[PDB]
Design a protein around this nucleic acid. Structure first.
Ligand SMILES: Nc1ncnc2c1ncn2[C@@H]1O[C@H](COP(=O)(O)OP(=O)(O)OP(=O)(O)O)[C@@H](O)[C@H]1O
Ligand SMILES: [Mg+2]
Ligand SMILES: [Mg+2]
Ligand SMILES: [Mg+2]
Ligand SMILES: [Mg+2]
Ligand SMILES: [Mg+2]
Ligand SMILES: [Mg+2]
Ligand SMILES: [Mg+2]
Lengths: 1066, 112, 116, 30
RNA sequence: AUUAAGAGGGACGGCCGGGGGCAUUCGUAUUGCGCCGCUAGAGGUGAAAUUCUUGGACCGGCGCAAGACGGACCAGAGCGAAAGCAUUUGCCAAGAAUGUUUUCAUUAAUCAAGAACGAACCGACCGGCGAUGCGGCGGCGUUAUUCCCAUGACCCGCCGGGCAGCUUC
């Protein structure tokens, strides 16, 4: 019902609000604290008039929080107690977010301690800093405050702030920021235009006092900062009239700040804060977009429309209702600032610190949020406001600039002297703008969005020097790749005739070169060196390295590209060129040739009707793609009755070859037997006939078996299975004793339908999905590697991991579809850790085929019959009401074990990638603990064919009997032979009821044995339970116990030679 | 793949059975005269016999189908003889071999 | 090998058109009508005029490398007659007389299914 | 008797390269 | 009062039909429009002349829009009281014949008046023989075969009501 859905949305809004708001009792205790702060601040001693340069009157233990780089000034200082104390901010406005509660107090400076010319050469900033220094000294000794600290207000390094927190209990309850402010009408608003000057060049840089030269450059950021203090009380007055009266407007503001918090768009210098949306909602109330009668959800809806549709970098908006002829124009602000907003006083940009890159990225998030808002579906509220979006998980590649001291030289290479003079000495924030624009224009085709990290606001205690710009933090850039345009390895420029070619030569330098093509055009072009798909994915690394060195004098050593470090986990020991996409395509082309060979074969009694592949290789999900092989004659011995080789006793285990299953359906006919075991006979005859014709017409090596035929073509081995359409129906025939024959599902019948019908459909469906998303193969293969490395490969089917990986690309509602393997793997770990498998089935909408009406009906049936379904339920359009891929899937135990491991591995892996230094060991999360297992079995690497696939490379390899030279082979190699898997089958059948075995199929050298606690308890003699159980008489009665000592030597006996040693603990 | 199994063993005389119950020994399975193969040695020997003979496979398939077709032909001939032909006590068996179509004895037909 | 082209021969009772295009029929190689050869409205559909038009088209093709032609014979169609005109037979003969090789012969006369 | 094409997907180069199986040439600047 | 008419009414069973209504849908042809290629003509006649064309007519290719129409399959076949009825699919109501050991029990026939709709030789003259459409019954044999959907295609005999022929009394 729509009423139920609306009520659910109302309930979801309310429970979020009560969590994020503050209680009444906390408000009272905060109110008592601020009254105590008011009493303390008003009782402060005064000092006589002193020169600003004279700072010896400061006692030891307190330092000026400004760095005062040009020390010569022209002012005098006097301290007086504050004339007026006013609480400003959002505390009295009723919009405070729970994790961080802050209260702002404005201190009105007396008129008699400030001079008319204090707005020049940072004199006011110096006086304000010394005012806080005197207050910090006198308030430190007071036992009321648990901690007192210095910090930056409004993200400005020239504006220090004072932090006070209470002692003992409630120490995390609230913090108070103390903001000195000038008298209301002290300064002239006309003196603080973006086009006017307030810092003189002779004082800032020159040694001469009146050196003549060019007119003084305007200082818009300096003017904005000075006016920022003068208008502190005005914002609260406007918001009280408009926002305090109407409830629900507060709800929308609170929800929007949570939305900004989740996407990490509020904190840092120049961030889009919750103060800004307070003015944005006021502007919308001024217009007809918002009226005061909506709820909080509608306010969130209305604001998000404005952000996604309005660009503030070209068309600024004004909050000033009055339109005076002698009023500042918006054109001037656009020339001075990247983003233009306005207040009732036109001089206040109010957004002078937010960059164009920041606003574009906020627009990007707003557009994504509107698509979820417009679409009607369940869990949309959870995805919109509760799903975190860190930079590492929202961008395909991240980039680190390790030494920020080099960024100062970038300002020297470029022309930012007026801008460096305007913002004091902050070279980091000055060059952030031009560098992003420089990189954005050079990466236009290969990128969708570029973002930069914001430096955190420092907090340092009294009696320490303030932090420098060099040690502010580390700079990180986020890149959102465009899937189209990554296929090309060239950047196409203009032709050499028209004169904008010279412009192209300027931007790229020596790498710009002349090229001619088949179309007949002479053209300027630049060519990179990228052979594989992975190398083409790292083309922007070459772009950013070349451009930064050429145009910013930033060496390549200062650039750390975090792109595909995980690619080594799905590669060879030393092969970093490709991740395996080229090998998979070659195998697919071989399969297509074989299908065409079947489609045209003559002499068969029944013609071929359908050829379908049912192997992970054909759907690009094989972790290690195969290669064509040529057996060595001397490494084996030969039967000479059949063209089949056998492994030798003295040589090590041969190379592993896995045949790929192909399902073939013949022409329908009515001459087939109606008996279950007789159809098995006809199928076996078809296996023999198919092998005989294939070797006669095309000279292919074929081996016929009762269930399949193995064909060697182009070095690849294919396993061909012939299936009969009505065979599953025959297996369902059950004549009942009363005398009526019916059709009932059977485990054999269900297995046959999965192998011949359901498996080819999923393989073909996932094959098509890879075509739209080239990054699907890397994510899926890496996901299997991590699961199998944690020794939890048993219980997780190959198809189940493919389907959950496909869910990332088909339903990435918070994000965009992944374009790099590393970002998909992080989202895969997040999905496993956070998904509620108990109350939600995973939907994989393969090629649409399901609408919202069918989804809610399936969801309704899911809760009605949850107990009959497995712990993990995956819903596909082909397979609904059941999950055939997880019926034999994970148990309740190992499912929770993976969630714990995934929740543990995610924080350390993201920390490794976000470290400015290189990752210490990318294989840390791929190693198992090896502590909980009762018995550990070690295997000899001589008889492990899949040993190059190990996580830890051994760097030494045995001879496996393969020929390096390509060519044909006249004989069948060894197929599907590995001692580790043969050993596991023997163990899991003899001791399956007693213990559990854990192994890694990719290079595993250890088998973990865990005893079952229930089986080891004494039991009475049951004849069926005497498998390895022995007779005790300690209690005077005959009971059964496992024979631990005899089982251990069975581990050595079974697998003789393969087993190296047996160690048992506890 | 074998695991833990049970054994039924038959001797010539019951006297040997009584000796088997009275037999007390280590029961070495592998001796120098009669070694028992295990490990990689056994699996290689197992992979040797896993490869089948196409001619032996073809003979069994043809033999089974020849027997199966003969059984089917006998049943059809017997049913053709028995169609119609009321027996004692006046009973006629309804079959699909007649000219009037009949309702099948299936669950799907009954529910329909 | 032989380089192939498509030749369209529209043969009305009033006029005869011979037109040679590529395999896709989108690019025009040469088009000569019956009226361009004879300076009389009586003989626009005459077999003599069509033969002259065919020779001029045929001679055009050889220097371009065209050696074989596919022929699409077409009449007025529609509500009118579906019979090839007098110029059709002479023009097709002249193309073979000029040494041009002949591919498949198809009629592409538009036949209406529902009478108006 | 007849097959018609109604809708085509987005043109992708790699799909065609399976069915059918550049940087350019160098020119010296003056 | 009895029976339950080779009198009539109703119900039930499986079918059958270009019967009617509402929506939905496809197919060529024609015409017009938009773009690409080419270049002096195209159209019409007994001969011409009205018309269209270097601002590109006609011809060749691709796509779009509009108004009609529903071929061949199509029969002396079928349906409706008549006038009349032909692409696909869904829906609504109606109907003939056949099958019936169901039900009522004379409730019927013909009709001036009146009412609904309405293109643009002769005569209830007994029969017969062939085919033909639907429904039913029986059958030696062929032919497919039934998860659902469906139990049919051909041949032979028989019973009814129809569309028509050829003959007879
Ligand atoms: N760009 C700006 N221009 C002018 N004043 C600003 C700007 N940014 C912040 N301020 C001022 O900073 C003061 C401190 O409040 P602030 O904006 O930090 O909100 P807050 O109390 O932390 O609110 P919330 O909890 O809702 O995020 C306010 O009085 C506000 O007017
Ligand atoms: Mg604040
Ligand atoms: Mg009666
Ligand atoms: Mg009826
Ligand atoms: Mg009907
Ligand atoms: Mg009908
Ligand atoms: Mg109808
Ligand atoms: Mg009939």
């Amino acid at each position: 019902e729509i009423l139920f859905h609306s009520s659910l949305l109302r309930l979801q809004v309310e429970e979020l609000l009560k969590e994020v708001r503050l209680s009444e009792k906390k408000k009272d205790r905060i109110d008592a604290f601020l009254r105590e702060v008011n009493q303390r601040v008003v009782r402060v001693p005064s000092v006589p008039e002193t020169e600003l340069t004279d700072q010896a009157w400061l006692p030891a233990g307190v330092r000026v929080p400004l760095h005062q780089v040009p020390y010569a000034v022209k002012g005098c200082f006097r301290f007086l107690p504050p004339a007026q104390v006013t609480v400003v901010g959002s505390y009295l406005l009723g919009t405070c977010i729970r994790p961080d509660i802050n209260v702002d107090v404005a201190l009105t400076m007396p008129r008699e301690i400030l001079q008319d010319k204090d707005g020049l050469n940072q004199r006011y900033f110096r006086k304000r800093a010394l005012y806080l220094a005197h207050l910090a000294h006198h308030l430190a000794q007071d036992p009321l405050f648990g901690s007192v600290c210095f910090s930056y207000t409004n993200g400005c390094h020239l504006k220090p702030s004072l932090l006070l927190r209470p002692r003992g209990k409630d120490e995390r309850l609230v913090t108070v920021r103390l903001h000195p402010c000038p008298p209301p009408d002290f300064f002239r608003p006309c003196r603080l235009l973006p086009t006017k000057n307030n810092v003189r060049s002779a004082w800032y840089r020159g040694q001469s006092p009146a050196g003549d030269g060019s007119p003084e450059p305007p200082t818009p950021r300096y003017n904005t900062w000075v006016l920022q203090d003068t208008v502190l009380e005005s914002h609260l007055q406007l918001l009280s009239t408009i926002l305090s009266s109407a409830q629900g407007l507060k709800d929308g503001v609170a929800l929007l700040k949570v939305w900004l918090r989740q996407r990490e768009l509020d904190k840092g210098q120049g961030g889009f804060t919750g103060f800004l949306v307070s003015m944005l909602v006021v502007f919308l109330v001024s217009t007809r977009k918002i009226h005061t009668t909506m709820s909080g959800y509608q306010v969130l809806r209305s604001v998000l429309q404005f952000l996604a549709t309005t660009d503030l970098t070209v068309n600024g908006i004004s909050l000033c209702l009055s339109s005076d002829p002698s009023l500042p124009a918006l054109a001037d602000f656009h020339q001075a600032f990247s983003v233009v907003f306005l207040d009732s006083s036109g001089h206040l940009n109010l957004c002078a610190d937010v960059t164009a890159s920041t606003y574009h990225q906020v627009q990007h998030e707003a557009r994504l949020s509107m698509m979820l808002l417009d679409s009607r579906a369940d869990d949309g509220f959870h995805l919109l406001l509760m799903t975190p979006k860190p930079m590492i998980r929202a961008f395909d590649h991240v980039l680190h600039l390790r030494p920020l001291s080099r960024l100062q030289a970038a300002c020297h290479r470029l022309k930012l002297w007026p801008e460096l003079q305007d913002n004091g000495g902050d070279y980091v924030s000055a060059a952030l703008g031009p560098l992003t624009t420089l990189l954005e224009q050079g990466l236009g085709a290969r990128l969708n969005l570029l973002a930069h990290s914001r430096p955190p606001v420092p907090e340092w205690d009294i009696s320490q020097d303030p932090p420098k710009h060099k040690d502010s933090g580390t700079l990180t850039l986020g890149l959102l790749l465009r899937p189209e345009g990554l296929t090309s390895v060239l950047e196409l420029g203009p032709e050499a005739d028209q004169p904008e070619a010279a412009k192209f030569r300027q931007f790229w330098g020596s790498r710009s070169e002349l090229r001619r093509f088949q179309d007949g055009a002479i053209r300027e072009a630049v060519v990179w060196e990228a052979a594989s798909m992975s190398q083409k994915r790292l083309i922007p690394h070459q772009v950013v390295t070349h451009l930064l060195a050429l145009h910013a004098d930033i060496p390549e050593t200062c650039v750390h590209y975090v792109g595909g470090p995980l690619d080594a986990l799905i590669q060879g020991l030393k092969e970093t060129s490709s991740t395996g996409e080229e090998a998979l395509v070659a195998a697919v082309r071989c399969y297509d040739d074989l299908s065409r060979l079947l489609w045209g074969l003559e002499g068969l009694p029944l013609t071929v009707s359908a050829v379908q592949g049912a192997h992970p290789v054909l759907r690009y999900t094989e972790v290690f793609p195969p290669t064509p092989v040529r057996p060595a004659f001397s490494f084996y011995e030969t039967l000479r009755e059949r063209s089949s080789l056998l492994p030798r006793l003295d040589k090590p285990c041969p190379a592993y070859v896995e045949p790929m299953t192909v399902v073939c359906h013949l022409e329908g006919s009515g001459q087939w037997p109606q008996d279950a075991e007789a159809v098995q006979r006809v199928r076996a005859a078809f296996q023999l006939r198919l092998a005989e014709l294939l070797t006669q017409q095309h000279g292919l090596q074929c081996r016929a078996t009762a269930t399949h035929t193995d064909v060697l073509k182009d070095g690849f081995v294919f396993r061909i299975r012939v299936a009969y359409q009505r065979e599953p129906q025959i297996l369902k025939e059950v004549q009942s004793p009363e005398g009526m024959i019916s059709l009932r599902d059977t485990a054999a019948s269900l297995r046959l339908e999965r192998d011949t019908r359901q498996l080819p459909l999923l393989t073909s469906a996932l094959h098509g999905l890879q075509q739209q998303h080239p990054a699907f193969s890397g994510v899926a293969r890496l996901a299997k590697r991590w699961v199998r490395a944690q020794l939890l490969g048993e219980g997780f089917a190959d198809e189940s991991l493919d389907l959950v990986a496909a869910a990332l690309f088909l339903h990435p509602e918070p994000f965009t579809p992944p374009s790099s393997p590393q970002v998909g793997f992080l989202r895969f770990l997040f999905l496993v850790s956070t998904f509620d498998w108990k109350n939600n089935p995973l939907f994989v909408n393969l090629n649409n085929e399901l609408t919202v009406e069918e989804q809610v009906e399936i969801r309704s049936g899911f809760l009605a019959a949850r107990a009959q379904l497995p712990v993990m339920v995956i819903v596909t359009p082909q397979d609904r009401k059941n999950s055939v891929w997880t019926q034999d899937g994970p148990s309740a135990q190992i499912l929770q074990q993976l969630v714990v491991l995934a929740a543990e591995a995610l924080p350390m892996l993201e920390k490794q990638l976000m470290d400015p230094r290189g990752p210490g060991d990318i294989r840390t999360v791929f190693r198992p603990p090896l502590d909980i297992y009762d018995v550990l079995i070690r295997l000899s690497p001589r008889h492990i064919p899949r040993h190059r696939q190990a996580v830890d490379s051994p760097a030494a390899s045995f001879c496996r009997g393969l020929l390096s030279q390509p060519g044909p082979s006249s004989l069948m190699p060894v197929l599907g032979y590995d001692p580790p898997q043969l050993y596991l089958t023997q163990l899991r059948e003899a001791f399956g009821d007693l213990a559990l075995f854990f192994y890694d199929q990719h290079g595993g050298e250890v088998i973990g044995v865990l005893w079952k606690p229930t089986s080891f308890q004494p039991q009475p003699f049951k004849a069926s339970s005497t498998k390895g159980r022995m007779v005790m008489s300690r209690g005077g009665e005959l009971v059964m116990v496992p024979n631990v000592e005899a089982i251990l030597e069975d581990f050595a006996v079974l697998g003789e030679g393969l087993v190296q040693t047996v160690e048992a603990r506890s | 793949v074998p695991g833990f199994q049970v054994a039924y063993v038959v001797f010539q005389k019951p006297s040997g059975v009584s000796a088997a119950l009275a037999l007390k020994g280590p029961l070495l399975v592998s001796t120098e005269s009669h070694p028992v193969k295990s490990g990689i040695h056994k699996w290689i020997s197992d992979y040797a016999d896993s490869v089948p003979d196409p001619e032996a496979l073809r003979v069994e398939v043809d033999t089974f189908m020849e027997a199966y077709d003969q059984k089917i032909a006998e049943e059809e001939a017997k049913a053709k003889e028995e169609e119609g032909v009321p027996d004692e006590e006046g009973w006629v068996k309804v079959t699909r071999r007649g000219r009037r179509p009949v309702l099948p004895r299936t669950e799907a037909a009954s529910l329909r | 090998e032989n380089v192939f082209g498509v030749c369209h021969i529209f043969a009305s009772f009033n006029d005869t058109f011979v037109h040679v295009t590529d395999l896709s029929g989108k690019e025009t190689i040469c088009r000569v009508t019956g009226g361009m050869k004879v300076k009389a409205d009586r003989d626009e559909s005459s077999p003599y005029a069509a033969m002259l038009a065919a020779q001029d088209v045929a001679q055009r093709c050889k220097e371009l490398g065209i050696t074989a032609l596919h022929i699409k014979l077409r009449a007025t169609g529609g509500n009118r007659t579906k019979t090839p005109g007098p110029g059709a037979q002479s023009a097709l003969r002249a193309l073979a007389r000029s040494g041009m090789k002949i591919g498949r012969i198809e009629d592409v006369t538009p036949i209406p299914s529902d009478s108006t | 008797r007849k097959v018609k094409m109604l809708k085509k997907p987005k043109f992708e180069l790699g799909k065609l390269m399976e069915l059918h199986g550049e940087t350019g040439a160098k020119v010296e600047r003056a």
